[PDB]
Enzyme design. Sequence first.
Site, PDB file in Angstrom:
ATOM      1  N   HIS A 158       0.818  -1.210   0.000  1.00 34.32           N
ATOM      2  CA  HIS A 158       0.000   0.000   0.000  1.00 34.32           C
ATOM      3  C   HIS A 158       0.852   1.261   0.000  1.00 34.32           C
ATOM      4  O   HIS A 158       0.498   2.256  -0.642  1.00 34.32           O
ATOM      5  CB  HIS A 158      -0.948   0.006   1.192  1.00 34.32           C
ATOM      6  CG  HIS A 158      -1.432   1.372   1.552  1.00 34.32           C
ATOM      7  ND1 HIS A 158      -2.539   1.948   0.963  1.00 34.32           N
ATOM      8  CD2 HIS A 158      -0.986   2.264   2.469  1.00 34.32           C
ATOM      9  CE1 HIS A 158      -2.732   3.150   1.477  1.00 34.32           C
ATOM     10  NE2 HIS A 158      -1.814   3.358   2.406  1.00 34.32           N
ATOM     11  N   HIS A 163       1.019   5.399  -1.989  1.00 34.06           N
ATOM     12  CA  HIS A 163       1.502   6.701  -1.542  1.00 34.06           C
ATOM     13  C   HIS A 163       2.667   7.217  -2.382  1.00 34.06           C
ATOM     14  O   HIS A 163       2.689   8.389  -2.768  1.00 34.06           O
ATOM     15  CB  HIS A 163       1.937   6.621  -0.069  1.00 34.06           C
ATOM     16  CG  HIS A 163       0.799   6.624   0.902  1.00 34.06           C
ATOM     17  ND1 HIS A 163       0.078   7.759   1.206  1.00 34.06           N
ATOM     18  CD2 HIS A 163       0.246   5.621   1.625  1.00 34.06           C
ATOM     19  CE1 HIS A 163      -0.863   7.456   2.084  1.00 34.06           C
ATOM     20  NE2 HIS A 163      -0.780   6.164   2.354  1.00 34.06           N
ATOM     21  N   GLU A 203      -5.474   9.584   1.408  1.00 37.25           N
ATOM     22  CA  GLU A 203      -5.807   8.159   1.438  1.00 37.25           C
ATOM     23  C   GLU A 203      -6.981   7.787   0.539  1.00 37.25           C
ATOM     24  O   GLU A 203      -6.972   6.704  -0.054  1.00 37.25           O
ATOM     25  CB  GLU A 203      -6.113   7.704   2.869  1.00 37.25           C
ATOM     26  CG  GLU A 203      -4.991   7.938   3.862  1.00 37.25           C
ATOM     27  CD  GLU A 203      -3.823   6.969   3.712  1.00 37.25           C
ATOM     28  OE1 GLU A 203      -3.951   5.963   2.963  1.00 37.25           O
ATOM     29  OE2 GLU A 203      -2.763   7.226   4.335  1.00 37.25           O
ATOM     30  N   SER A 222      -4.123   1.153  -3.873  1.00 42.20           N
ATOM     31  CA  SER A 222      -3.595  -0.140  -3.462  1.00 42.20           C
ATOM     32  C   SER A 222      -4.691  -1.160  -3.180  1.00 42.20           C
ATOM     33  O   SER A 222      -4.394  -2.240  -2.669  1.00 42.20           O
ATOM     34  CB  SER A 222      -2.697   0.007  -2.229  1.00 42.20           C
ATOM     35  OG  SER A 222      -3.445   0.370  -1.082  1.00 42.20           O
TER      36      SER A 222
HETATM   37  C1  LIG Z   1      -4.328   9.902   9.896  1.00 44.66           C
HETATM   38  C2  LIG Z   1      -4.687   8.468  10.305  1.00 44.66           C
HETATM   39  N1  LIG Z   1      -3.491   7.790  10.847  1.00 44.66           N
HETATM   40  C3  LIG Z   1      -3.200   7.916  12.144  1.00 44.66           C
HETATM   41  O1  LIG Z   1      -3.925   8.581  12.882  1.00 44.66           O
HETATM   42  N2  LIG Z   1      -2.073   7.284  12.647  1.00 44.66           N
HETATM   43  C4  LIG Z   1      -1.278   6.540  11.774  1.00 44.66           C
HETATM   44  O2  LIG Z   1      -0.282   5.985  12.243  1.00 44.66           O
HETATM   45  C5  LIG Z   1      -1.609   6.440  10.476  1.00 44.66           C
HETATM   46  C6  LIG Z   1      -2.709   7.070  10.031  1.00 44.66           C
HETATM   47  N3  LIG Z   1      -2.835   6.836   8.730  1.00 44.66           N
HETATM   48  C7  LIG Z   1      -1.824   6.066   8.372  1.00 44.66           C
HETATM   49  C8  LIG Z   1      -1.623   5.580   6.930  1.00 44.66           C
HETATM   50  C9  LIG Z   1      -2.829   4.742   6.445  1.00 44.66           C
HETATM   51  C10 LIG Z   1      -3.824   4.271   7.192  1.00 44.66           C
HETATM   52  N4  LIG Z   1      -4.648   3.604   6.366  1.00 44.66           N
HETATM   53  C11 LIG Z   1      -4.145   3.661   5.129  1.00 44.66           C
HETATM   54  N5  LIG Z   1      -3.016   4.372   5.183  1.00 44.66           N
HETATM   55  C12 LIG Z   1      -4.795   3.056   4.040  1.00 44.66           C
HETATM   56  C13 LIG Z   1      -5.811   1.993   4.458  1.00 44.66           C
HETATM   57  C14 LIG Z   1      -6.733   2.612   5.479  1.00 44.66           C
HETATM   58  C15 LIG Z   1      -5.899   2.893   6.718  1.00 44.66           C
HETATM   59  N6  LIG Z   1      -1.052   5.797   9.435  1.00 44.66           N
HETATM   60  C16 LIG Z   1       0.229   4.968   9.496  1.00 44.66           C
HETATM   61  C17 LIG Z   1       0.090   3.485   9.102  1.00 44.66           C
HETATM   62  C18 LIG Z   1      -0.981   2.756   9.888  1.00 44.66           C
HETATM   63  C19 LIG Z   1      -0.029   1.555   9.761  1.00 44.66           C
HETATM   64  C20 LIG Z   1       1.061   2.623   9.912  1.00 44.66           C
HETATM   65 FE   LIG Z   2      -1.879   5.040   3.602  1.00 42.86          FE
END
Ligand SMILES: CCn1c(=O)[nH]c(=O)c2c1nc(Cc1cn3c(n1)CCCC3)n2CC1CCC1
Ligand SMILES: [Fe+3]
Length: 279
Positions: A158, A163, A203, A222
């Site tokens: 993903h 990204h 996202e 993705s």
């Molecule tokens: C702003 C929200 N958020 C957050 O509050 N803390 C994070 O750590 C985070 C995140 N958003 C991502 C990126 C992300 C999450 N999702 C997707 N990309 C695509 C599929 C749906 C969920 N992360 C970091 C990853 C989580 C594993 C490390």
């Molecule tokens: Fe993401």
Amino acid sequence: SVPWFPKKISDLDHCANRVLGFKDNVYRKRRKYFADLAMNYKHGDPIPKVEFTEEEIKTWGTVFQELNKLYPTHACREYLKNLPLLSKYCGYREDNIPQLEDVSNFLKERTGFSIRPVAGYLSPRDFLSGLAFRVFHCTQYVRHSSDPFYTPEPDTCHELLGHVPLLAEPSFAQFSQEIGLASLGASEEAVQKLATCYFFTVEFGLCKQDGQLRVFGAGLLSSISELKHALSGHAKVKPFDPKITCKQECLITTFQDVYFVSESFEDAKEKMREFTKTI
Ligand SMILES: CCn1c(=O)[nH]c(=O)c2c1nc(Cc1cn3c(n1)CCCC3)n2CC1CCC1
Ligand SMILES: [Fe+3]
């Protein structure tokens, strides 16, 4: 008072380790190898290169080939322009999982963005803070091989396919950085709206290009099923406008109930600018 926030790029050391096939203990052993790698990482380090297993490369290859069939008709222009660059320079192939280090050095050259490995979910504050320094917290593990096409949590497939191609685009990198910059030291309420706006652009965002709806959200790029769903006729689509978008619930376990369309990256950025003034 203002909560702590990183002041320089190495300050992400103190917040990237604040982490908040499920009965497959072999997979769990592999996953925590990746977790330890990210936990032990410190700014300035080369990102550790990993020898992915034959099983993992096959999973990446199954994801990669199917998504590349859809990108020409689904992905926004900017995505389509940078993906070949990554194939030439970071080894994006069906048979090879690109290394985070190589992708990080490519992005540093194109837009100044860099990658830092993360073990799992950070707080929205910590995650958005990395964007302020053009640092994307990236997962390094590969999803479970039993299901190449759905993953509960994001994996490196993903990150690399969703990204990275947009982080290489100057207009997008500016937009992303300004989300993080606005988050630094902001109120908990303000962080939550910035994270929601991030969720429905970075996202899961759509954009209109030459009258056509195209995708730029990484979670769509993705996901084979939701990518098709978003550009189908089944999808509820609304104009991106932060004051309403920030009130939208970010769904994780299902398809999104709504996708927001931005006119362009430059326009989403301008709208973000006005929105952060009021918050
Ligand atoms: C702003 C929200 N958020 C957050 O509050 N803390 C994070 O750590 C985070 C995140 N958003 C991502 C990126 C992300 C999450 N999702 C997707 N990309 C695509 C599929 C749906 C969920 N992360 C970091 C990853 C989580 C594993 C490390
Ligand atoms: Fe993401």
